[PDB]
Design a protein around this ligand. Structure first.
Ligand SMILES: Nc1ncnc2c1ncn2[C@@H]1O[C@H](COP(=O)(O)OP(=O)(O)O)[C@@H](O)[C@H]1O
Lengths: 111, 55, 371
């Protein structure tokens, strides 16, 4: 099909990253209701695959920032919330890659 | 006068980068101390729960 | 169709649409009017600025707040505030949107009645509803049980709730809040020679408070350390210069919440009214209430207030009980979050006050089962 070998390579690695999302581990904090990661190895490897920073992705999962008018304030998360977010992220990236693959297929077919 | 306040701006830049490197080194040592403190406080919170349970 | 969620409060209007994670329009609830002469012909200047526009022209206007302590005291100004919120910050036609409004517990009845009368006659909404702020804080907190302390800018209150049932006889309301903290900080800044008297300098003092003040864990030891060392001194740069140096009044200001005798009030601190609401509740729910003490509102945003309140409530309550204080980072907007959640609930769509109900029953329909 019309697409290169690097592109198949990226497809395979992206699917492997989706697979690496599942083993993440989060714990509640000391005397609070905030989620913090205890295991970091799968985080590091999933970031190295995805093309992001590991500390940065962990911070983006534990502490989302939302827009209130003209400012940004950090939102709090617990383990259930961060797990639901991880699952929704994986489902989203998979479905996105799928739709774009179909677009590539149609572009190859296009006359 | 331009070179005068220029030299003062440059010496301010020197001492300002001094203050900045002090800020960064201090925050490193203090985040290490912090993480140590939370390790200690969590282990002692669990030990407090153990103690009340034995009580 | 979508509902609007306008959380007025006393000093910060924040509005948006039901079903979002945050308000899209947050601005002060001030109405400024020019107080000087006006010389340039053809300048075509207006007569009253509202919202964030009035903050850029503080040096020319006299700033009014239309809401003193929860209560609305200037209905013309409030109508201007609402018009601005609907048409200039949000850009929506309020005749095609239900509107959810909030108010504090234990306010006058005419406040609420006149509010709905305005919203139906002037702005012509299809439906509307007024909600208690503490209940919405509890929605946004993800709980159904807990005692919520909602310190806004004009009013502080506790509202204990258990399994979704609110205990009205244990509701406490206190008229000490951020506005009184600002006035006290203006009064004690004069000990070092700074004087802020203008309504436009009140805003400078409010920004100082927000950026520099914090709650001390131990007030006497912090006073001693401020007297001895100089490691607490912090500087602030006014809109011009003459950087001001602030010492122990960094923490003497918000300590008024725990010692209301500082501003000559008779009542007790927020920790003690929280504990009193607890002991006012039943006995079978006090453990859950101790374990679900929820903070919200802007005046709960000082560094150290959660730890201080936990220390105090723990010293008050019995030793066998575990006290817990829930203080999310998005506390300032909790009432709005909860309002959005509630208005998006599909069960709620039968709770609106429709326009026909109002037309047939008068503004009295608001205290009725249509709450
Ligand atoms: N970071 C902060 N630290 C201390 N006080 C704050 C902070 N942010 C806001 N405030 C105070 O909170 C008040 C606004 O609270 P808000 O949630 O807007 O209540 P309302 O909406 O009822 O006016 C302001 O008077 C301000 O002084």
């Amino acid at each position: 099909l019309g697409f290169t070998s690097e592109e198949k390579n990226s497809m395979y690695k992206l699917t492997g990253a989706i697979m690496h999302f599942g083993n993440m581990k989060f714990k509640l904090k000391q005397r609070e209701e905030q989620a913090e990661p205890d295991g970091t190895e799968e985080a590091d490897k999933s970031a190295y695959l995805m093309g992001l920073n590991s500390a940065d992705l962990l911070k983006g999962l534990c502490h989302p920032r939302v827009k209130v008018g003209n400012e940004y304030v950090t939102k709090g998360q617990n383990v259930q919330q961060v797990i639901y977010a991880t699952g929704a992220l994986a489902k989203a990236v998979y479905e996105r890659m799928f739709n774009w693959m179909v677009t590539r297929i149609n572009a190859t077919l296009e006359t | 006068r331009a070179q005068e306040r220029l030299a003062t701006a440059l010496q301010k830049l020197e001492e300002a980068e001094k203050a900045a490197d002090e800020s960064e080194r201090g925050m490193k040592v203090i985040e290490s101390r912090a993480q140590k403190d939370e390790e200690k406080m969590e282990i002692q919170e669990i030990q407090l729960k153990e103690a009340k349970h034995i009580a | 169709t979508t509902a609007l969620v306008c959380d007025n409060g006393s000093g910060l209007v924040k509005a948006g649409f039901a079903g979002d994670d945050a308000p899209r329009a947050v601005f002060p609830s001030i109405v400024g009017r020019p107080r000087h002469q006006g010389v340039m012909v053809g300048m075509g200047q207006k007569d009253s600025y509202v919202g964030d526009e009035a903050q850029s022209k503080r040096g020319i206007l006299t700033l009014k707040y239309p809401i003193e302590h929860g209560i609305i005291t200037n209905w013309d100004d409030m109508e201007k505030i609402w018009h601005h919120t609907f048409y200039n910050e949000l850009r929506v036609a309020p005749e095609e949107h239900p509107t959810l409004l909030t108010e504090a517990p234990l306010n006058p009845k005419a406040n609420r009645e006149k509010m709905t009368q305005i919203m139906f006659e002037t702005f012509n909404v299809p439906a509307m509803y007024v909600a208690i702020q503490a209940v919405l804080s509890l929605y946004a907190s993800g709980r159904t049980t807990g005692i919520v302390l909602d310190s806004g800018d004009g009013v502080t209150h506790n509202v204990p709730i258990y399994e979704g049932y609110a205990l009205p006889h244990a509701i406490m309301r206190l008229d000490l809040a951020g506005r009184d903290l600002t006035d006290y900080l203006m009064k004690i800044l004069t000990e070092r020679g700074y004087s802020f008297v203008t309504t436009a300098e009140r805003e400078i003092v409010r920004d100082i408070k927000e950026k520099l003040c914090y709650v001390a864990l131990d007030f006497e030891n912090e006073m001693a350390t401020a007297a001895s060392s100089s490691s607490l001194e912090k500087s602030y740069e006014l809109p011009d210069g003459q950087v001001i140096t602030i010492g122990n009044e960094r923490f003497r200001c918000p300590e008024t919440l725990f010692q209301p005798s500082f501003i000559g009030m008779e009542s007790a601190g927020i920790h003690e009214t929280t504990y009193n609401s607890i002991m006012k509740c039943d006995i079978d729910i006090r453990k859950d209430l101790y374990a679900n003490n929820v903070l919200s509102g802007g005046t709960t945003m000082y560094p150290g207030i959660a730890d201080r309140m936990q220390k105090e409530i723990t010293a008050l309550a019995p030793s066998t009980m575990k006290i817990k204080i829930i203080a999310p980072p998005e506390r300032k907007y909790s009432v709005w979050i909860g309002g959005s959640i509630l208005a998006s609930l599909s069960t709620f769509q039968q709770m609106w006050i429709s326009k026909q109900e109002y037309d047939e029953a008068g503004p009295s329909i608001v205290h009725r089962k249509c709450f």
